Amino acid sequence: SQSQGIQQLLQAEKRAAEKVADARKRKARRLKQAKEEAQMEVEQYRREREQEFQSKQ
Amino acid sequence: EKKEKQIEQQKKIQMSNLMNQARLKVLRARDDLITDLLNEAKQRLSKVVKDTTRYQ
């Protein structure tokens, strides 16, 4: 049954390979999300600064 | 911030404008005082002319 143990280990390695590639895919998704949120934050920062400007004015 | 510095610059220009106009206003008032004196001098000279014994 060694050949079966070896194939089951091969299957486990294949899953490990998938799990890491998937982690890299998420990494990429998270980076894009980070950029989108950043821009959302910039728009809100500008809003705050604009409100302060008008108050000061 | 740069626009605010310009807004502060606008405030200083308004103050500069205000001080410059205040200076001109008081200078104009001073010139009125000089004119009042000279117009009084004209009236004083007229009173002298009316006096035959000095006008002749």
Curated annotation (Swiss-Prot), chain B:
> Partners and quaternary state?
V-ATPase is a heteromultimeric enzyme made up of two complexes: the ATP-hydrolytic V1 complex and the proton translocation V0 complex. The V1 complex consists of three catalytic AB heterodimers that form a heterohexamer, three peripheral stalks each consisting of EG heterodimers, one central rotor including subunits D and F, and the regulatory subunits C and H. The proton translocation complex V0 consists of the proton transport subunit a, a ring of proteolipid subunits c9c'', rotary subunit d, subunits e and f, and the accessory subunits ATP6AP1/Ac45 and ATP6AP2/PRR.
What is the covered span of the full protein? 58 to 113 of 226
Q: Which residues form a coiled coil?
A: none
Q: Where is the signal peptide?
A: none
Q: Where are the transmembrane segments?
A: none
Localization per Swiss-Prot or TrEMBL: Apical cell membrane; Cytoplasmic vesicle, Secretory vesicle, Synaptic vesicle membrane; Cytoplasmic vesicle, Clathrin-coated vesicle membrane
- Where, by tissue, is this protein expressed? Expressed in brain (at protein level).
- So what family is this one in? Belongs to the V-ATPase E subunit family.
Cited function: Subunit of the V1 complex of vacuolar(H+)-ATPase (V-ATPase), a multisubunit enzyme composed of a peripheral complex (V1) that hydrolyzes ATP and a membrane integral complex (V0) that translocates protons. V-ATPase is responsible for acidifying and maintaining the pH of intracellular compartments and in some cell types, is targeted to the plasma membrane, where it is responsible for acidifying the extracellular environment.
Q: What is this protein called?
A: V-type proton ATPase subunit E 1
